[model samples]
Every structure is written in structure tokens, then in C-alpha cells.
Target: RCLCIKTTSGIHPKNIQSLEVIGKGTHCNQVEVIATLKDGRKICLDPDAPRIKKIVQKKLAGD
Candidate 1:
């Protein structure tokens, strides 16, 4: 048996890639997200510093 939670959001994990740990904060860790949108736009998120603890999954395809 398993417990599952269905979720929906503005961004799907499929379009997210290139995750890196930039630094650490007093409370949590900072991460960088390299995302590719469906429209073919490459955007850099949280540049210069890590601002998020987590977003989209980190495993990628062939783990």
C-alpha cells in the first residue's frame, strides 16, 4: 500500500534541470535552478546566491 498526493502547479518538474547547491544559510541551504521553459527560453533562477531550499525534483532522468 502507498499514500499518494496529487499535485498541480504553475511549473512542472519535467522542464526543470541543472540543479546546484550554491551556498548555505542560517536556517537552510541555498540552491540554484537552471530551467528550460516550454517556449524555449532558458532562465537562470536565484543567481549570485542560493535563495531556495527546494524546487522541482533534483534526480533528473537516469539516476
Candidate 2:
């Protein structure tokens, strides 16, 4: 079974931030993450970002 988990990096020397990972049948990979900066701004990371998922593809006008 596939599962998704959301978490945040703890205080460390590394770039600590909020991260989201997806588990696809035991394979874990980063799907999305947010980089919370000390100044309050945020950065995000997303895979397949500009592409469409199956559902979204089907919703397209010519789909």
C-alpha cells in the first residue's frame, strides 16, 4: 500500500524545514516540501510540478 507522510526537519546545522514525502508501495520519495526561512518567507519544492496527474489530465478540455 502507498502512503504519504508530512514532517518538519528539526533544529540542526542543515537546512531545516517542512517536508512532505510519498511512500509508493514501500518506496519513499519527496513529493513536496516547504522551506521555512528565519525571515518568515517560504520556499516550496514539488515533483512533477508542471505536469498533470491522471485526474487533472482527464479534466482538461480535450481530455
Candidate 3:
């Protein structure tokens, strides 16, 4: 039961204020990437996108 019913891979990095990576668990069967925009909008991101991966990695690396 993933919280994200739909996702997009087109968001720009500069517009992303922060990101939350949800791990797979009993509540969900796959990874979830939630992005918070500078405008205070929340959107779900496609995990397989190369840009998303880079953003996630950079965030996790404390950059």
C-alpha cells in the first residue's frame, strides 16, 4: 500500500526544497521518493529516474 499512487520524473533539482526516501516495508512493497518543493508542494518521484537517484544520493551523503 504505497502512499504514492502516481509519480513523475521531470522535476528540477533547484525547485526541490528537500526529499524523503521511504523504505520498503509492510505498509509498502517498494521504495518511495517524496519531494518537497520550495513552494511547499509535495510530489512523488519515480525512483528509477537517474536524476532522482543522484538527488537522493547527494541528500544522503549530506551534501
Candidate 4:
């Protein structure tokens, strides 16, 4: 099941501690983007946004 019921479009990279991408599957029909902030707060991000895509890619590339 998706932990995200709502999503935001932006968040500063400096505030992010980690990013998780969950692909659509039998449990959920939508892609989910979860960002853990340095403060230990978790938030959902818009997965289809270009900026979010870049951030995810950069994270995946080990940047």
C-alpha cells in the first residue's frame, strides 16, 4: 500500500536526507516518491515533476 495520500511539488535538496522511489504495482497503481528530511520528517513528492525526476536520477546515480 502507498504511504502517500498527498504530494508536494518541491522541497529543497539541502533539506532532504534521503529519497525513495516506489514503482506502481499490485499494491498501488501510482508511482510514489517519499523524501525523508534531515529533521526526520517524511513527505510525499510529485513523481511526475521534472525537478523531482532529476533529483531521483541524481540520487540513483550516487551523486
lDDT of each: 0.41, 0.38, 0.88, 0.86
| Candidate 4 regions with alpha-carbon error over 4 angstroms | 60-63
**Pairs with steric clashes in candidate 2:** none
> Which of candidates 2 and 4 is the stronger one according to TM-score?
4
Candidate 1 deviant stretches above 4 angstroms: 1-32, 47-51, 58-63
What are the per-residue Cα lDDT tens digits for candidate 2 across 1-63? 223243333323234233333433345444544545555645443434443233223333334
| Candidate 1 clash pair list | none
Reference-based TM-score, model 4: 0.82
lDDT of 1 by residue, 1-63 (tens): 111122123354456554433344554344334455556755545533222223533344333
TM-score of 1: 0.29
Distance from true position, residue 31, model 3, in Å? 0.5
List ranges where model 3 is wrong by over 4 Å. 58-63
Model 4 local distance difference test score: 0.86
lDDT of 1 at 59: 45
Ranking by lDDT: 3, 4, 1, 2
The RMSD of every model to the true structure, in order and in angstroms, is: 12.4, 12.4, 1.9, 1.7
Q: Alpha-carbon error at 61 in model 1, in Å?
A: 10
Tens-digit per-residue lDDT, 1-63, candidate 4: 877999997776778889888899999999998999999999999998898888877777777
Q: Write the per-residue lDDT of candidate 3 for residues 1-63, one digit (tens) a residue.
A: 899999998876788889888999999998998999999999999999898888778777767
